[PDB]
Structure 1
């Protein structure tokens, strides 16, 4: 719950949104627009949508009180992807790559 730990989270979030990772991060930038994409079963399968723009809003609004709450939202975003999409799908390979970025930097959390 320290300021320092939340700044580490904010750094991770900025990195996930940065051009460095855009080739595989872009499916996670905005909420899944199920209607626009023709995914009429998406909200029957995914109970708690999450995406990086929502994480960013919650960070800016000071919604997150500790790093664990932030990590749970980021991991929820990936979990939704793993739930809705077959494991051999391109978007799942992108999720795995971005989650690799997230988990290895999140592990460097200041104590």
Structure 2
């Protein structure tokens, strides 16, 4: 009863499915679920990152029709990557992973009809 996604949002939904797919798992896995700061001992994470975001939250928002347009979806995906660049030193392995997954995202987002 949620309504058909617009053409641009269908493209966004396809990108999201790709980001979650097995073929990108080697670098996408840190982004699948909310950072569990407690479990990882990152007791400063929520002081530094005011707006956490991750792919499972983006998926829930897409399914719930929270995104009004492609720009709102893109801003959330980019917020997730920016959080990673903000919290971690630039030479961290997770930053390299973020950069790889963000390239997948940005190159396909640039193909939106």
How big is the shift at 1:83? 0.2
Distance between the aligned counterparts of 1:11 and 1:65, measured in 2?
A: 16
**CA-to-partner distance for each residue in 1:73-109, whole Å, 9 max, x for gaps?**
0000000000000000000000000000000000001
Q: What is the aligned residue count?
A: 108
Aligned to 1:57: 60
Query: SS of the residue aligned with 2:39?
Result: helix
**CA-to-partner distance for each residue in 1:54-80, whole Å, 9 max, x for gaps?**
000000001001000000000000000
RMSD: 0.2
**CA-to-partner distance for each residue in 1:1-23, whole Å, 9 max, x for gaps?**
xx100000000000000001000
Distance between the aligned counterparts of 1:73 and 1:107, measured in 2?
A: 16
Aligned to 1:8: 11
Distance between the aligned counterparts of 1:75 and 1:50, measured in 2?
A: 9
* TM-score (normalised: structure 2): 0.95
Higher helix share: 1
How big is the shift at 1:37? 0.3
